[PDB]
Protein: DNA polymerase eta
Organism: Homo sapiens
Amino acid sequence: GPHMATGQDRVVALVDMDCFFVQVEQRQNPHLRNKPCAVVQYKSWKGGGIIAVSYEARAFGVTRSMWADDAKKLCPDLLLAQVRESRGKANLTKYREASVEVMEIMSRFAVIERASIDEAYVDLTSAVQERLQKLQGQPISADLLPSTYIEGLPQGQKEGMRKQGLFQWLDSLQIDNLTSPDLQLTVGAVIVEEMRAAIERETGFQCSAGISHNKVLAKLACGLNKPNRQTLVSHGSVPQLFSQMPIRKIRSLGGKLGASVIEILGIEYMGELTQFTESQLQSHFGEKNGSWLYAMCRGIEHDPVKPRQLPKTIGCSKNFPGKTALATREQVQWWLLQLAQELEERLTKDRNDNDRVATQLVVSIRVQGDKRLSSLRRCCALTRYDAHKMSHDAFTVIKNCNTSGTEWSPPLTMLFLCATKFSAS
DNA sequence: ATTGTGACGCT
Ligand SMILES: Nc1nc2c(ncn2[C@H]2C[C@H](O)[C@@H](COP(=O)(O)NP(=O)(O)OP(=O)(O)O)O2)c(=O)[nH]1
Ligand SMILES: [Mg+2]
Ligand SMILES: [Mg+2]
């Protein structure tokens, strides 16, 4: 009753950019705007692999991970932008820099946790307290939430249903109680409207946001009304939402763990989790997962918004599939040097921008026919931002995989260099 | 012959 804490302390938002790499290319190339288009990596093998799709193109069934030739079968007027290639590999620099544009704007409003190239969490609890004090009890106008959806409303066209849901939400608000969680979420959603307006005005990119009380609900909410919309998921809307929410839709249950939850417990939806005691979940899925699951199916999650705007690692990766697998010593050296050269450029820029230095170089390889994605992961010291030195050290650290008596065997299907263990500089 | 990243957990 009174002592059952509800995980309504925080206001957390998740902002994710809509079809981000396509928007970056559409800003640079006006001819792609308001068109079915996608961004691919490479072009020789089946026209390249798609990693980003505009919503127009999605209406035709185009998705990420499709080959571009297959996508063209679904969508014959599809436009394609290609990722830059450098030293024979995909170069994602332009999007990392567009990302930084967006992150720098988000940082003005609150402390953010970069969750990926195109998305960040925001802890808005302090900002909402401030804005609540400034309103001095003034009610909240639907003008202030022009793109906000309220999940589970209305109850009892799209813009119409959205505005109906927003009016039902706003007429039920107790605006006098500075401590009502629902009010706090509302004020958060006003601030997130302002943040998304600033992002679009200062970059031309559009995004969606989830506003809720924790990261998992914010992230789930963010997807509910993409594109170019934001969704408030209240604590009170969790039971209905989760009663038909497949377990795999929750961040981190989309894989092996989620499948075991489904299979062992004999359930399909998030809501059904509430019928198990914490100990039952801890027995089946370990003590941590169990605690996390017991709280999560009630809408409660405690993972903090970490103050971390920058990646913790900087890495360069390239597959060598099938008959392009590296089979000679010269080949492994030339590609370790290409990877090391890109890594060096990125690290030198990181040092000058962010006043820090990586201290550990990780080399990962896959050998042909291996089942695993990574066959060997070995670390060594990183003492200089010198590509020739890094590549030589990667070779020294992996050379004892070669079973040849000039040749390389088994042939390498992946090289991966990664700088980690950063330190102030 | 999705590929290229990046976080975090387990032991
Ligand atoms: N290299 C590479 N880049 C990828 C991959 N997957 C995604 N990206 C890149 C391209 C993506 O633009 C970007 C962000 O990924 P999302 O937020 O998951 N997708 P988006 O923003 O496109 O659409 P939505 O509106 O649904 O959020 O990361 C991949 O497998 N490989
Ligand atoms: Mg996105
Ligand atoms: Mg994303």
Notes: The CA atoms of residues 11 and 213 of chain A lie 5 Å apart. The first strand of chain A starts at residue 12 and ends at 17. Chain A has three domains: 12-18+94-239, 20-93, 314-424.
